[PDB]
């Protein structure tokens, strides 16, 4: 996509409460005398229009992004405020007086905050603003400089959350007959990306508070000296008592943002708010079980942009292998590995049963999975197998050589691998291909790789998976609608933004965590498509699917996922609880009213790795 608008813009603009408190704070500050305003990171320009409507004499809005800047120019002009608001395509750090802005401003308004508060560089931007773009602070509001937000209190809480854990810690020491040795320590990219961002009010499986909430930091955005002192401030060593028995999985962080002395915003987890929380995963501990009487220790600092929580330990009453969170979720996906072990054993049993646990001829197995994979080690433990790994990273090879060694493989049993024959005049008995992206879409050129792979197979040899079924269902989801499009002008307090920003939406929502999404089912899930790697003649380009509507409702989306068939009996589900793949959905531009008992027709168009789903 050439012209992107980030998904969080739709969610935020749809949050009437957020828009109300920001407009209330700006109205109060403008009416009190702050007549010259600078909006840092204007987005659509909503805070600038609030300032001008409140009665500001001069409004300047700066926007880093070319796309957001151009959109903001059109929104402001459509709201008849072209003459009153001056939009600037620049980062606020590059603004010079009188070159870009003629005079120092009395009020800075900004929303350049993330779940961890500091992740968008609010400190660096406000230090530059106080030094070069703002009037002197208070010792009449027109005479002195002020910032919205005024201040913040940052909170933390130790939690048990199995959903976070399966993405940052490998939770088992034995997978599908293979041992994962102690001398190989797996760690996520958050180990020392200090935190991920999560909607903890709806996290799959939920979370449990193991401690009470605690203050981790405070910051005064109107205090330049306090802001400059952050770069060299020594970390704050804190000790938190444990109030509940449980597995320590993360420190969940949120903040209370004080816009002024009357108006405050909380990012505390709630299904009533749009705000996500900062999640600091707990890893590299000897024991994760914590009980009342224990103390959770950590070091909180904010010297180089991001808020950091380091040296996490529990105070009572070896090769390191960095993996992506998708690869850790993969190692924690037991049905995937057990399914692959059983499917590989059946191929070995049908082709060479004496090899299952020419004597010089091994059963050749190629794993073309993308990223870290242990499938070649599982294959090697099964029989007289010559397995090949496609890992690129040197650290991954070392780890796999140590895993191979722990599974009694003599040196160079496992080898590291364009699709070609194992050896000139030799054929593969098993080829594993990566068909579904973690995004929930089909991998690019998979049909082409399958066609090339089929020519390299021994008679009776198999490509894994053999075929993939795409499943989908009709849903009424107001949540998917509000994360895809701004719902009117009432949400944006009379301002016309929705028609202009809604144009930058994409038809397919990827990386969807379907189980955490509030949905009303309007149909039962049904097979939409068959992607056959062993028998492409069974594929269909153009198909109409008649979906029985079980329940009357407003159809807003068609979520979809897959059943990957390793053979006729063994299938993997990309929507399963332990799945390391995310799902996806076709979200409708205009929701359709459907009635119980009708057969809705979906048009499913398949060309190579593309699938188009529309209501016919
Ligand atoms: C530093 C800077 C940024 N920019 C521009 O402004 C925006 C930066 S902010 C990034 C998104 C923040 C959303 N945070 C919401 C949130 C918070 C907490 C919890 N949950 C959320 C949810 C769940 C809702 C995402 C962006 O348009 C940039 O191009 C600037 N332009 C001019 N000069 C500058 N110095 C800047």
Curated annotation (Swiss-Prot):
Q: Which reaction does it catalyse?
A: L-arginyl-[protein] + 2 S-adenosyl-L-methionine = N(omega),N(omega)'-dimethyl-L-arginyl-[protein] + 2 S-adenosyl-L-homocysteine + 2 H(+)
Which terms does the UniProt entry file under GO BP?
Answer: chromatin remodeling; methylation; mRNA processing; regulation of DNA-templated transcription
Tell me which UniProt keywords the record has, alphabetically: Cytoplasm, Methyltransferase, Repeat, S-adenosyl-L-methionine, TPR repeat, Transferase
| Record note on pH | Optimum pH is between 7.5 and 8.0.
User: Any idea where the SAM-dependent MTase PRMT-type domain is?
Assistant: 1-309, 333-616
Compartments (UniProt record): Cytoplasm
Q: Which GO terms describe its cellular component?
A: cytoplasm; nucleus
Domain of life per record: Eukaryota
Q: Does the keyword Secreted apply?
A: no
Top-level EC class as recorded in UniProt: transferase
Q: What is its EC number?
A: 2.1.1.320
The annotated thermal profile of this protein reads: Optimum temperature is 37 degrees Celsius.
Single GO molecular-function term? protein-arginine N-methyltransferase activity
Q: Which family does the UniProt entry place this protein in? A: Belongs to the class I-like SAM-binding methyltransferase superfamily. Protein arginine N-methyltransferase family.
Quaternary state and partners of this protein?
Answer: Found in a complex with PRMT9, SF3B2 and SF3B4. Interacts with SF3B2.
Q: What does the protein in this record do?
A: Arginine methyltransferase that can both catalyze the formation of omega-N monomethylarginine (MMA) and symmetrical dimethylarginine (sDMA). Specifically mediates the symmetrical dimethylation of SF3B2. Involved in the regulation of alternative splicing of pre-mRNA.
Name the record gives this protein: Protein arginine N-methyltransferase 9
Q: Which organism is it from?
A: Homo sapiens
Q: What is the lineage of its organism?
A: Eukaryota, Metazoa, Chordata, Craniata, Vertebrata
């Amino acid at each position: 996509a050439n012209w992107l608008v980030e998904r969080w813009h739709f969610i935020m603009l749809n949050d009437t409460k957020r828009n109300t408190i920001y407009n209330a704070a700006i109205q109060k500050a403008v009416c009190l005398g702050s007549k010259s305003v600078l909006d840092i990171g204007a987005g659509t320009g909503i805070l600038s229009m609030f300032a001008k409507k409140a009665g500001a004499h001069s409004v300047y809005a700066c926007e880093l992004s070319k796309t957001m800047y151009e959109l903001a120019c059109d929104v402001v002009a459509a709201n008849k405020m072209e003459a009153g608001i001056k939009l600037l395509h620049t980062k606020s750090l590059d603004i010079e007086i009188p070159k870009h802005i003629p005079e120092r401003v009395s009020l800075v308004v900004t929303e350049t905050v993330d779940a961890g508060l500091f992740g968008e560089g609010i400190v660096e931007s406000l230090i530059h603003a106080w030094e070069h773009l703002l009037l002197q602070p208070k010792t009449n509001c027109e005479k002195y400089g002020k910032v919205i937000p005024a201040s913040a209190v940052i909170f933390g809480m130790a939690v048990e959350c199995a959903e976070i854990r399966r993405h940052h810690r490998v939770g088992i020491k034995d997978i599908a007959g293979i041992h994962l040795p102690t001398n190989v320590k797996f760690q996520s990219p958050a180990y020392s990306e200090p935190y991920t961002t999560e909607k903890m009010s709806r996290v799959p499986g939920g979370y449990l508070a193991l401690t009470e909430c605690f203050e981790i930091m405070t910051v005064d955005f109107n205090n330049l000296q306090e802001l400059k002192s952050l770069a060299t401030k020594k970390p704050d060593k804190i000790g938190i008592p444990v109030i509940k028995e449980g597995i320590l999985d993360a420190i969940m962080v949120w903040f209370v943002l004080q816009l002024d002395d009357e108006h405050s915003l909380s990012t505390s987890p709630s299904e009533e708010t749009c705000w996500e929380q900062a999640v600091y995963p707990v890893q590299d501990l000897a024991d994760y079980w914590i009980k009342p009487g224990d103390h959770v220790m950590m070091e909180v600092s904010c010297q180089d942009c991001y808020l950091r929580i380091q040296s996490i330990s529990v105070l009572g009453l070896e090769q390191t292998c960095i993996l992506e969170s998708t690869e850790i979720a993969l190692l924690n996906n037991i049905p995937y590995h057990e399914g692959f072990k059983m499917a590989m054993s059946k191929v070995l049993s049908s082709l060479t049963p004496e090899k299952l646990y020419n004597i010089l001829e091994p059963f050749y197995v190629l794993d073309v999975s993308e990223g870290f994979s242990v499938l070649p080690v599982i294959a090697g433990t099964l029989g007289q197998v010559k397995p090949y790994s496609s890992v690129e990273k040197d650290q991954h090879r070392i780890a796999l050589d140590l895993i191979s060694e722990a599974n009694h493989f003599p040196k160079e049993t496992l080898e590291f691998w364009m699709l070609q024959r194992p050896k000139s005049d030799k054929l593969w008995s098993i080829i594993i291909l990566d068909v579904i992206e973690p995004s929930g879409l089909i991998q690019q050129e998979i049909m082409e790789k399958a066609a090339i792979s089929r020519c390299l197979l021994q008679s009776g040899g198999k490509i894994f998976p053999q075929y993939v079924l795409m499943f989908g269902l009709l849903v009424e989801s107001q949540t998917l609608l509000e994360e895809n499009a701004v719902q009117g002008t009432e949400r944006t307090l009379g301002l016309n933004i929705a028609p202009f920003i809604n144009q930058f939406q994409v038809p397919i929502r990827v990386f969807l965590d379907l189980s955490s999404l509030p949905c009303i089912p309007l149909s039962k899930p049904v097979e939409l498509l068959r992607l056959d790697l062993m028998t492409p003649y069974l594929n269909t380009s153009n198909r109409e699917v008649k979906v029985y509507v079980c329940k009357s409702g407003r159809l807003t989306a068609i979520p979809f996922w897959y059943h990957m068939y390793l053979d006729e009996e063994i299938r993997l589900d990309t929507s399963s609880e332990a799945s390391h793949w995310k799902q996806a959905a076709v979200v409708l531009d205009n929701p359709i009213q459907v009635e119980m008992g009708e057969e809705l027709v979906l048009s499913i168009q398949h060309h190579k790795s593309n699938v188009s789903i529309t209501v016919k």
